Amino acid sequence: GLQVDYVFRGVEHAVRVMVSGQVLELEVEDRMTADQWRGEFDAGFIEDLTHKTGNFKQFNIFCHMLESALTQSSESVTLDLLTYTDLESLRLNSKRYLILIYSVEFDRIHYPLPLPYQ
Amino acid sequence: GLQVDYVFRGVEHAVRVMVSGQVLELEVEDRMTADQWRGEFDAGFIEDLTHKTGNFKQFNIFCHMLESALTQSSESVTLDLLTYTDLESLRLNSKRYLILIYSVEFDRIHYPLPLPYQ
C-alpha cells in the first residue's frame, strides 16, 4: 500500500490508497481529530465516473493518475478535498469528496470520489 | 480564412480552414497534381465525433486545437493525413482522413475528419 501526508486547505491529512485486483480503496484521515473518510471503488464504478465527465479513463490509468497526484510526481494531476458545502454551492453532512483534478492544454477535468465519514 | 503549407508524409500540402458560425470548412490540396480533398462539418457533427473518442471537445475548442496544430503553435496537438489503406489496416478509394492527434500526459486521442476527393 501507499501512505502519504497531503495538505488540503492548509490541513495536513494522512492518505492511504490500496489497489488490489480491480478495486480501489482510499482513506483520508485528520490525525488531530481522528476523523476518517473511507471509500471503496471497483473498476466498473471508476469507468462510469470518468466516462460521465466526458474524459474517459481506464481503471488502471485512473489509479496511476491518483498515485501520481498523491506523490506529486506529475504536472497535470492534482488533488483537492471538498466538503458538502463546496458541492451544493457548485450545484450528517460530514461526507468528503476527494477531487482528482486533471489539467492539460485543452482540458480541465474534475473526477469526484465520494468518501463517507467513518 | 487561414491558409498554411503542411507536410504530410514528406509531401507539402496546402491546407485551408474556414470557421463561420457553427460550421467548419476544410480543404487539403496537392498543388503538383491539383488533387483536392474537402470536408464540411457542423458543430453537431464535431461534438458527436469527439464524444465517440471518449475525450469530448466543444466545437469551438476543437476548431482552436485544429488551428493550433496547423500553425504548430501548441505542443499537444499535431496533424496527419491518412489514406484508405491506413484505415482498413487500422480496422474510388481516393478519400483522405485528416487526423487531429491530441497528445497529453494521460491521453492520446485521434480525431478523424473525412475529406472526400474532389
Curated annotation (Swiss-Prot), chains A, B:
Residues of the region (Head domain) are 1-118
Q: Where in the cell is it found?
A: Cytoplasm, Cytoskeleton, Microtubule organizing center, Centrosome; Cytoplasm, Cytoskeleton, Microtubule organizing center, Centrosome, Centriolar satellite; Cytoplasm, Cytoskeleton, Cilium basal body
Briefly, what is this protein's role? Microtubule-binding centrosomal protein required for centriole cohesion, independently of the centrosome-associated protein/CEP250 and rootletin/CROCC linker. In interphase, required for anchoring microtubule at the mother centriole subdistal appendages and for centrosome positioning. During mitosis, may be involved in spindle assembly and chromatin alignment by regulating the organization of spindle microtubules into a symmetrical structure. Has been proposed to play a role in CEP170 recruitment to centrosomes. However, this function could not be confirmed.
As for family, the record states: Belongs to the CCDC61 family.
| The record's note on its domains | The coiled-coil domains are involved in microtubule-binding.
Could you describe the subunit structure of this protein? Answer: Forms homodimers (via head domain). Interacts with CEP170. Interacts with PCM1 and CEP131. Binds tubulin.
Q: What else is known?
A: The N-terminal 3D structure (head domain) resembles that of NHEJ1/XLF, PAXX, SASS6 and XRCC4.
| Protein name as it appears in the record | Centrosomal protein CCDC61
Quick one: which gene encodes this?
A: CCDC61
Quote the range of the complete protein represented. 6 to 140 of 512
